[PDB]
Amino acid sequence: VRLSPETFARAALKLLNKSGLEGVSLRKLGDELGVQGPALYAHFKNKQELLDLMAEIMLDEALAPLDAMTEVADWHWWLAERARTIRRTLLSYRDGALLHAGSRPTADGAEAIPALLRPLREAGFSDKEALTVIITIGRYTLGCVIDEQRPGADDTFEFGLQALLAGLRARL
Amino acid sequence: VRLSPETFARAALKLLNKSGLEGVSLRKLGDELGVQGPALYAHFKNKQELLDLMAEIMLDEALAPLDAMTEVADWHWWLAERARTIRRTLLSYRDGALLHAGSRPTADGAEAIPALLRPLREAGFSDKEALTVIITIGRYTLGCVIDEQRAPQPGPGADDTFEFGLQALLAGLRARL
Ligand SMILES: Cc1ccc2c(C)c3c(c(O)c2c1O)C(=O)[C@@]1(O)C(=O)C(C(N)=O)=C(O)[C@@H](N)[C@H]1C3
Ligand SMILES: Cc1ccc2c(C)c3c(c(O)c2c1O)C(=O)[C@@]1(O)C(=O)C(C(N)=O)=C(O)[C@@H](N)[C@H]1C3
Ligand SMILES: [Mg+2]
Ligand SMILES: [Mg+2]
C-alpha cells in the first residue's frame, strides 16, 4: 500500500472493529503491515498520533455532508445534526468513544477549522467562541456515548443537547 | 477486615489508583484481599457490580458537603458545584472517568436519589426532569474529563471549555422552568 498517514490510519480503523482499541498500536499495526510496518513510524511517533488521525477520519466520513454546506441559514439545526451524527458514528464503531477520547485535530484537520466555524461566525459567535462551541458540543456527545454503553438514552441525549443549544442561543 | 461490600470496593479503589482500571477485577481484588478474597463473591455477581459501587463511593466522598445542604435556594450554583466537584474528583483518580463510564446507581445509592433531586424539584423540575438533569450534567462532565486526559491545542483550554459548556447547559435548563 502507499506510504501515507491516511492509508495507515484507515487500515488501523479496520483493525479497531476487528480487535478493539486494545488491538490497536504502532507495533500491533506494523504487524498487520508486514515489510511495510517500519514505515508506520515515519508518520506516527506514538499511539496517540495514530489515534488522532483515526478519530478525525472516522467522524469526517460521517460529517462530510454537513461540512460541504455553504451559507448555512440555521446554525441551531446544523450544530444539532453534527452532534447527532457524531453520536451515531461513535456508537457504530467498536470502542468508538474510547478511541475518540483524548484525540485532538491533526495539522490537516486544524486547517479545516475556519471553514467549520463559519456557520457559527455568520450567526454572531466570535471566532474564539465558535471554536469553544464546537469543542463543547463534541464533549457533551462523547460523554453521553461513553456512558450510555452498559454491558431513554436517546431522550436524555436530546434533552441535554437542546438545553446546551438554548444556552448558546442566549449568548447571542 | 470486615466482610462488607463497601470495605471491598474501597480496597478496589486503592487498586485502581495503584494499577489503573486494568488492575481492577473480581479476581484481582480477591488477590489483594488474600485469604479473605473468596468473600467478595458473596457480594458482587460480576465486575460491573463492583465498578458501580466504586464509582458511587468515589464521588460520594467529594459530593458529601453538597449533599448535606438543605433548603438549597440557588440550584444553579449547587448544580454547577456538583459538576465542578465531579470533574475534580474524576481527574484525581487514575482512570477515574474510565472507571465511571457505564456505571449506574446501586440499590443503596438509588435510595438517595429523592434527596439528591430536592433542590431541583423545589426549583420547579418534575421528578423525571430532575433526574434527567442530574444524568445530563454528569454525562457532560464525564465527556469533558475523559477528553481532557491525553503541546499547544486550539481553543481556550480544559477549564474554560468545561465552564463554557456547563454555564450554557445550566442556562438552557433554567429556560424550561
Ligand atoms: C482541543 C480541540 C481543539 C479542536 C478540536 C476540533 C476542531 C474538533 C474536535 C475536537 O475534539 C477538538 C479539540 O478537543 C472534535 O472532537 C470534533 O469531532 C467535533 O467535536 C466536531 C463538532 N462538535 O461538530 C467536529 O465538527 C469535528 N470536525 C471535530 C472537531
Ligand atoms: C441512568 C442513571 C440514572 C441515574 C444516575 C444518577 C442518580 C447519578 C449518576 C448517574 O450516572 C446516573 C445514571 O447514569 C452519576 O454519574 C452521578 O455521579 C451524577 O451525575 C451526579 C450529579 N450530576 O450531580 C451525582 O450527584 C452523583 N450522585 C451521581 C448520580
Ligand atoms: Mg474530539
Ligand atoms: Mg454516572
Automatic annotation (TrEMBL), chain B:
Start and end residues of each HTH tetR-type domain: 2-62
**Which residues are listed as membrane-spanning?**
none
Superkingdom of source = Bacteria
**Which Pfam families does the UniProt record give?**
TetR_C_1, TetR_N
Asked if the keyword DNA-binding belongs to this entry, the reply reads yes
Where DNA binds (residue ranges)?
Answer: 25-44
A molecular function annotated in GO for this UniProt entry is:
transcription cis-regulatory region binding
Keyword terms of this UniProt record:
DNA-binding, Metal-binding, Repressor, Transcription, Transcription regulation
The UniProt record gives the binding positions of Mg(2+) as: 100, 147
Is DNA-binding there in the keyword field? yes
Biological process (GO) annotations held by this record are: negative regulation of DNA-templated transcription; response to antibiotic
In terms of PANTHER family, this protein maps to:
HTH-TYPE TRANSCRIPTIONAL REGULATOR BETI, HTH-TYPE TRANSCRIPTIONAL REGULATOR RUTR
User: This protein is called what?
Assistant: Putative transcriptional regulator
